[PDB]
Every structure is written in structure tokens, then in C-alpha cells.
């Protein structure tokens, strides 16, 4: 009965860019989700399966932990049925989603004086992302008839852009870390309970 390493996702020093969102697989451990739900240091804690207090009394075959950084505006987009640059080209929740979406403001950590350019997001994509897909390609979007041939140009743009987080930014433009916990139950014995 080992403890689920929830600390190593939540309290991790370095967080990923939404376009290359990290996934950690949780298994063969017990986790108290109720301490997480009552922390109040999370600005966002919406659940789409069952209430956070009730799943403490629920088992699961696997818990996947997806982590990334976005803007305040874009948090609402981390939800099923949501449209937007994040939800369409970066990370899309399915409509059958049965998990929780958690976030907190990381202005203190992730915003820097002249703009932090490490965090990226995908500005152009030909098609909307399927749920739980990850695209990390760096192919040049072709936005016009002129073929791109792999060279940045006119109507040929490198497909990723950067939030330039400044601590002076308004709230909506401030970085938010996000952890998405998806609870899966298969034809296999459960390994994650409370």
C-alpha cells in the first residue's frame, strides 16, 4: 500500500509547455484525493466523473496525470466540448471525460522580467486535435498557396508561438499550471484507491 506520488507532479520544479504536455501514469498505490480537493491553493478544481469526496471511496485501474502551463484565459478551455487555440491545437478533453481538472497561478514562478519565452503554444494547425493527442512537430504551417518547402517565409510560419510571461501582466495573461487527472477503469484489477 504505497502512496501515490502526487507530489512529484504537483510540486515539480519544472512544468511542460502545453503543446508537449507531460503524462505520468499512476498505479499500485493509494491516494487521498480529499487533501488535494480541500487545499484551496488550487484556483481550479472541477471534476467531471464523481465528486472529489466520493472518489476517495472509489478504485481505479489507472490514474493518468497530465501537466502543462497556460494563460488564465485558457483555463476555461481545459474542459470537454471547449473550442479555442488550446483545446483545438494543444490539448483536448473528450466529451466522455471522467476526471478532474486542477490549476493554480504560477506568476511567482513562471513569469520573468523581459518575458519568459520557454513556454510555447501551437498557434497554427491544419486540423483540430483529437482528444488526448500530443503534437510536438515543428513543421512550417502553410497559410497560403505558395508551398512552404520547409523554410520560414511569407504565409509560411513556424507553427509555435510563446506566451511572454511578465509579472506585470494582467491576471488573464499570467501563467497557470494545470494538472489533469483522468481516471480509467479497464478489464483489469484496480490499483489506485483511497
Amino acid at each position: 500500500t504505497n502512496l501515490c506520488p502526487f507530489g512529484e507532479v504537483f510540486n515539480a520544479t519544472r512544468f511542460a509547455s502545453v503543446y508537449a504536455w507531460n503524462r505520468k501514469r499512476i498505479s499500485n498505490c493509494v491516494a487521498d484525493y480529499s487533501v488535494l480537493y480541500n487545499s484551496a491553493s488550487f484556483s481550479t478544481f472541477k471534476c467531471y466523473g464523481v465528486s472529489p469526496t466520493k472518489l476517495n471511496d472509489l478504485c481505479f485501474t489507472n490514474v493518468y496525470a497530465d501537466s502543462f502551463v497556460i494563460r488564465g484565459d485558457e483555463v476555461r478551455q481545459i474542459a470537454p466540448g471547449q473550442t479555442g487555440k488550446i483545446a483545438d491545437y494543444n490539448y483536448k478533453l473528450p466529451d466522455d471525460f471522467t476526471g478532474c481538472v486542477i490549476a493554480w497561478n504560477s506568476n511567482n514562478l513562471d513569469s520573468k522580467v523581459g518575458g519568459n519565452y520557454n513556454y510555447l503554444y501551437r498557434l497554427f494547425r491544419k486540423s483540430n486535435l483529437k482528444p488526448f493527442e500530443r503534437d510536438i512537430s515543428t513543421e512550417i504551417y502553410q497559410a497560403g498557396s505558395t508551398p512552404c518547402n520547409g523554410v520560414e517565409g511569407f504565409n509560411c510560419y513556424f507553427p509555435l508561438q510563446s506566451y511572454g510571461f511578465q509579472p506585470t501582466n494582467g491576471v488573464g495573461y499570467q501563467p497557470y499550471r494545470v494538472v489533469v487527472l483522468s481516471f480509467e477503469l479497464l478489464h483489469a484489477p484496480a490499483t489506485v484507491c483511497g
Partner: antibody
Framework: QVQLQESGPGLVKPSETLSLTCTVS?????????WGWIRQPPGKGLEWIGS???????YYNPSLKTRVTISVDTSKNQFSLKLSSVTAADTAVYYC????????????????????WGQGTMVTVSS | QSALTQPPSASGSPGQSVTISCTGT?????????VSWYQQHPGKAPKLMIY???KRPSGVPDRFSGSKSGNTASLTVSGLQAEDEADYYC??????????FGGGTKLTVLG
């Protein structure tokens, strides 16, 4: 507003190691961008040496690859240059500069344009 | 000696317009749009005039402008003044080889 400043030994003995450092201020090197070294022999053309971003990744000019190391120390917020086996062809004004683009994954990152430049420190190689 | 070939000198008369060319190969200039022009006055650090072929940094006069066709880049100075008398260097990415420079071109104002 960002400022770059080169410092280092004015003189170097032939076949020994040239060691200059560049101290950034006004912007944490770790926060973004590529950062490069470019040199100009007296009365001769610009030469690009190498660039680096905060992870430690480096790109170098093929003709000086075997002799060049560029390092980053983020805690002191500076980057440095060592060039070994110096000859008189290394007598030059050595500039440090910052790139135009803050994104570190753009095509040809650190090998495009340099926006902010230092004053330049000169190194003469002589006995 | 320089993998980008740039005319050793160039000149124009005050009020007029002068153009400096910069020829490489399909693997540098012809290959990518990362072509950069710098202006260096004697005894002073280089200054960026033009990046990404035609893009002007802030504070750079509109009189300056750059372009490219095929293997050859151009920097055109309009309304030539005395303060423009300097050396100009061009630059471009080279794939395997990285960030190659031109030999430079001295521009005289001819007054």
C-alpha cells in the same frame, strides 16, 4: 533594459587558452533567447563563433569547433568563451551579443540575427 | 575568404539611393530567409539594421531596407547622408555550416 559586458585578460600567450566572460544584466539569461560570441580581427571582417542558451546546448562555427567551448552559468547570469591553441589569427575584438528571437526552438535558433551587442573586449595574442 | 561575397566598396551621392549586394549559394541565402545586415562605424560595435531579410529593428530609419532574389540579398539606402558612411556586413544561416558572414562593403557618401 538588457546590457551585455565582456571582460577578460587583455593579453594571452600563444598556444595557451583565451578566456573571456560576458555578464548579462537586466534580463535573466535563463528566461529565454540565444546568446552568442562574434569576433573581428583588427581591420578585417565579422566572424561568428558560437551561441548557447540556458540549457547548455551550443552551436559552433565549423572552422573553430575543435578549439571552442562556450559555457553558461545561470546563477551568476553570465556566459563565457574559451578558445584553445590561440595564434595571431585569434587577435581580435571579441563581442558578446543577444539574439533577436526569444524562442529557443525556432529554426536556426542562435544562428540568425543578433540584437543587443556588448562594447567589445580586445585580445592580443603575443609572447 | 568569405563564404558570402560582398562588393569590396560601394558609393552614392547625398540625397540619392545606394544598393549593396550579397551573394551566397542555395544552401545559405537562397535556402532560408534568415538574412541579416549590420552597420559598423569605425571603432564602434556592430549594429543590427535588418533581420529576416526585410524586417527592420526598431529605431532604424525607413530609408534603410533590404530584400533578396535567389542567391543574392540587397540592402538599399535611400536619402543618402554623411552619417551613413560606414562598413556594412551581411549574414545568413548555412545549414550544416552555421551563421556565415560576408567580407563587408565600405560605403562612401561622395560629397
Amino acid at each position: 533594459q538588457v546590457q551585455l559586458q565582456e571582460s577578460g585578460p587583455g593579453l594571452v600567450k600563444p598556444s595557451e587558452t583565451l578566456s573571456l566572460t560576458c555578464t548579462v544584466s537586466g534580463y535573466s539569461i535563463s528566461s529565454g533567447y540565444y546568446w552568442g560570441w562574434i569576433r573581428q580581427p583588427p581591420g578585417k571582417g565579422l566572424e561568428w563563433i558560437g551561441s548557447i542558451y540556458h540549457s547548455g546546448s551550443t552551436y559552433y562555427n565549423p572552422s573553430l569547433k575543435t578549439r571552442v567551448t562556450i559555457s553558461v552559468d545561470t546563477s551568476k547570469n553570465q556566459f563565457s568563451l574559451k578558445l584553445s591553441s590561440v595564434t595571431a589569427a585569434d587577435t581580435a575584438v571579441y563581442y558578446c551579443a543577444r539574439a533577436v528571437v526569444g524562442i529557443v526552438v525556432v529554426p536556426a535558433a542562435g544562428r540568425r540575427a543578433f540584437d543587443i551587442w556588448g562594447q567589445g573586449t580586445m585580445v592580443t595574442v603575443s609572447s | 575568404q568569405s563564404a558570402l561575397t560582398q562588393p569590396p566598396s560601394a558609393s552614392g551621392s547625398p540625397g540619392q539611393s545606394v544598393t549593396i549586394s550579397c551573394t551566397g549559394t542555395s544552401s545559405d541565402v537562397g535556402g532560408y530567409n534568415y538574412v541579416s545586415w549590420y552597420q559598423q562605424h569605425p571603432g564602434k560595435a556592430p549594429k543590427l539594421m535588418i533581420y529576416e531579410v526585410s524586417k527592420r529593428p526598431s529605431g532604424v530609419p525607413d530609408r534603410f531596407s533590404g530584400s533578396k532574389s535567389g542567391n543574392t540579398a540587397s540592402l538599399t539606402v535611400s536619402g543618402l547622408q554623411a552619417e551613413d558612411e560606414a562598413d556594412y556586413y551581411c549574414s545568413s544561416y548555412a545549414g550544416s555550416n552555421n551563421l556565415v558572414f560576408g567580407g563587408g562593403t565600405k560605403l562612401t557618401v561622395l560629397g
